[PDB]
Structure 1
Amino acid sequence: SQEHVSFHVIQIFSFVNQSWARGQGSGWLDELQTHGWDSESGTIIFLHQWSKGQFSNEELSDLELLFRFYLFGLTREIQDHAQDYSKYPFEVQVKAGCELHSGGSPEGFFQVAFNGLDLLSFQQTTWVPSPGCGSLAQSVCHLLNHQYEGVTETVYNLIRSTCPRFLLGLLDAGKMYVHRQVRPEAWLSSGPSPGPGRLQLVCHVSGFYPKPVWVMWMRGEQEQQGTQLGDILPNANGTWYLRATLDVADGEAAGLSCRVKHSSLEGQDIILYWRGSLVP
């Protein structure tokens, strides 16, 4: 395919007050969680059999040591440069990783948010403050640009080189999972009443993978114009869920059907006719 693919490490931490914080971290291949972090032991949790992504135990142990050193330094620096109780609680989000474009060109990124707003990002070899984050952003970038040069170099190599190599190793190690086909099932229900003398028809499609899917309300071969597609929602175990809905007048719902097309179905669409209260 020509589809872009990404790998991200994310971190979320919050300081409740000047001396107490909690944090979480994880690793994601597109929208699939592949790694957790055990903060007690400070170690990577490998969620799948293929989560080592063709890296050796030594490479992964060195990465783990790096992350622990990062967390130690981050903690010490925040404690030193903290102390007014009005600034607390605050929450920081970090998103670092890489995107592989269709031709193989890698793009690394490292972005930070503070209290839900952009704070700074890593651009080429410079920490760039977000304008909207004002003096705090400038302060943090000053520290990063002038007091941790080794950190800057390490981050550059992690997001530009280590990350794409790991991402592709994960795709290879996990090839039987990432290329799988999972067939959906479908069923009908009534949704919330649109109004007196009207019906909301709902077609549920659940358990499909991969994500591309086609669902529509039909009268014969004619697609119904009022059909609304909900957000595609996650199931556990990696599959997806979608509701397709249609409002219709009572006395016009008969003859309508839900039709589902998916790669896993090998040409045999799922077709369900609305029954409602029509059958005694």
Structure 2
Amino acid sequence: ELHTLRYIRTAMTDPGPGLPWFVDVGYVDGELFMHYNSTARRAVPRTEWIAANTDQQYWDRETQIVQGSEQINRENLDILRRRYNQTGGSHTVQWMSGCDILEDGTIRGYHQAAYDGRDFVAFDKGTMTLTAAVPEAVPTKRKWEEGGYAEGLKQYLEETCVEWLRRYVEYGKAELGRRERPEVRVWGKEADGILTLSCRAHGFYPRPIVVSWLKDGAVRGQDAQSGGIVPNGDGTYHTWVTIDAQPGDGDKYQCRVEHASLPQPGLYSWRSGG
């Protein structure tokens, strides 16, 4: 299939009250497996499958690298504040890096930054240069290119990342490949109760889902709204969809749920005769 490895990091001037200024988190197929913050200063396991499939030297090597990342991004905050001629305020440096193992067999690589939530730089592994998204990123480009990082980064994205991703997918194939059935509730609210109807799929895994409305057994996209996919504390997902109906029309509607955990689409009504 397709597997993704993602490392996201944020360095912030204002996190704030009792919260770490620097945080790094790792993702395999969208699932959190590692964490680092500037208070603990240690890389830590977040899933059962990564722990007991890795020894102490793995976490020691990860700790050292992210401690290095932390210090660079501390400096980055100072460098960019000065370059932008900013006096105080709330500022952030964000990084996203990793790789994709596409269905085709082909490999995608990413190494990119944002300053104050706007694209700053991105590595173009095709041309072996760092692309400047803004004029303030031109001195960055010149320093980074002179630093000779392209070679090692191309190598990391096309090979080391891919190899690491294969390892992790193998350690967590059972958890990543599991199926969790959602518990579904159809509800309604306002004039006698049938203005806004809601359908909620609680606790599904994996993330892909299709939640739609049927009125007298026919698909209804009209007056429908989705809240998207939202997470639960246990790694499972939640989604809520609404449709605006005429008062007294509650019994006409059904919520259709298409998910991997369901052999056939689930059809649900607001209570029984509501």
Shorter-chain TM-score range: 0.7 to 0.9
Aligned to 1:141: 141
Aligned to 1:126: 129
In the superposition, relative to structure 1, how do residues 167 and 222 fare at CA in structure 2: closer, same or farther (>3 Å)? same
Q: What does 1:204-215 align with in structure 2 at a 5 Å threshold?
A: 204-215=200-211
Of 78-87 and 106-115, the range deviating more from structure 2: 78-87
Task: Report sequence identity in percent.
Answer: 20
Letter in 1 for 2:24: G
Is residue 143 of structure 2 the alignment partner of residue 116 of structure 1? Answer: no
Aligned to 1:156: 154
Task: Provide the rounded CA distance (Å) in 1 between the counterparts of 2:224 and 2:159.
Answer: 43
TM-score, scaled to structure 1: 0.79
In the superposition, relative to structure 1, how do residues 264 and 227 fare at CA in structure 2: closer, same or farther (>3 Å)? farther
Aligned to 1:236: 233
**Larger CA Rg, structure 1 vs 2:** 1
Q: What does 1:59-208 align with in structure 2 at a 5 Å threshold?
A: 59-75=58-74, 83=82, 86=87, 88-124=89-125, 125-130=128-133, 133-134=134-135, 136-146=136-146, 148-149=147-148, 151-191=149-189, 193=190, 199-208=195-204
In the superposition, relative to structure 1, how do residues 154 and 43 fare at CA in structure 2: closer, same or farther (>3 Å)? farther
CA contact (8 A) 1:38 1:45 kept: no
Task: Provide the rounded CA distance (Å) in 1 between the counterparts of 2:258 and 2:52.
Answer: 33
Of 198-207 and 44-53, the range deviating more from structure 2: 44-53
Of 100-109 and 50-59, the range deviating more from structure 2: 50-59
In the superposition, relative to structure 1, how do residues 35 and 239 fare at CA in structure 2: closer, same or farther (>3 Å)? same
* Match among 215, 218, 224 for residue 214 of structure 2: 218
Root mean square deviation of aligned Cα: 3.1
In the superposition, relative to structure 1, how do residues 274 and 139 fare at CA in structure 2: closer, same or farther (>3 Å)? same
In the superposition, relative to structure 1, how do residues 59 and 35 fare at CA in structure 2: closer, same or farther (>3 Å)? closer
* Match among 250, 254, 259 for residue 262 of structure 1: 259
In the superposition, relative to structure 1, how do residues 38 and 243 fare at CA in structure 2: closer, same or farther (>3 Å)? closer
Structure 1 unaligned runs (5+)? Answer: none
Aligned to 1:250: 247
CA contact (8 A) 1:27 1:36 kept: yes
Q: Aligned pair count?
A: 264
Per-residue deviation at 1:61? 3.3
CA contact (8 A) 1:188 1:274 kept: yes
Per-residue deviation at 1:78? 6.1
In the superposition, relative to structure 1, how do residues 65 and 152 fare at CA in structure 2: closer, same or farther (>3 Å)? farther
Deviations 1:127-175 (A, max 9, x none): 2211xx21x20111222111x22x4444333323221111221111011
Letter in 1 for 2:263: E
Task: Provide the rounded CA distance (Å) in 2 between the counterparts of 1:264 and 1:23.
Answer: 38
Of 254-263 and 90-99, the range deviating more from structure 2: 254-263
Task: Provide the rounded CA distance (Å) in 1 between the counterparts of 2:5 and 2:152.
Answer: 17
Letter in 1 for 2:210: W
CA contact (8 A) 1:53 1:168 kept: no
Letter in 1 for 2:117: G
Question: What secondary structure sits across from 2:99 in the alignment?
Answer: strand
CA contact (8 A) 2:24 2:36 kept: yes
In the superposition, relative to structure 1, how do residues 77 and 266 fare at CA in structure 2: closer, same or farther (>3 Å)? closer
Task: Provide the rounded CA distance (Å) in 2 between the counterparts of 1:272 and 1:252.
Answer: 12
In the superposition, relative to structure 1, how do residues 79 and 248 fare at CA in structure 2: closer, same or farther (>3 Å)? closer
Question: What secondary structure sits across from 1:241 in the alignment?
Answer: strand
CA contact (8 A) 1:90 1:114 kept: yes
CA contact (8 A) 2:185 2:270 kept: no
In the superposition, relative to structure 1, how do residues 246 and 69 fare at CA in structure 2: closer, same or farther (>3 Å)? closer
TM-score, scaled to structure 2: 0.81
